[PDB]
């Protein structure tokens, strides 16, 4: 019921073969920064180019993901019987150089371009948010025990 590394790679391969610009995020993004898997993962987080929103969703449905939560254009959660949960987040690659995301209650979140980078993971180049970005997106007041584990891993290993 968890997302295996090979299953992660398949989802990554989908976006890459679609030629849709994307970055790995969330828990799997953290492990990928460390260089190896650290724990079991319920879900995958992917930030992707919002201009391909319709193409991405249609493709995810084609392979059997069902839409469970739909807060678009900010965020959508899908569910696959085998591959598990996938959260996708449309991001805008803007002309000003900024990367933005729809704010569910009216407006845009503003992110810096350098938060979204790439790292080597088992001889594979994986686009993912930086270590600094993971920390920024975490709230130092409201961490789960797993969040604490993940953050200590980013510190203890990297």
UniProtKB/Swiss-Prot annotation:
Example of a GO biological process term: response to antibiotic
Keywords, sorted A to Z: Antibiotic resistance
The keyword Secreted appears for this protein: no
Domain of life, per lineage: Bacteria
Pfam family, one: Aminoglyc_resit
Disulfide bond entries: none
The UniProt record lists the keyword Zinc: no
InterPro entries in the cross-refs: Aminoglyc_AdlTrfase, NT_sf
Designated name of the protein: Lincosamide resistance protein
Provenance organism: Staphylococcus haemolyticus
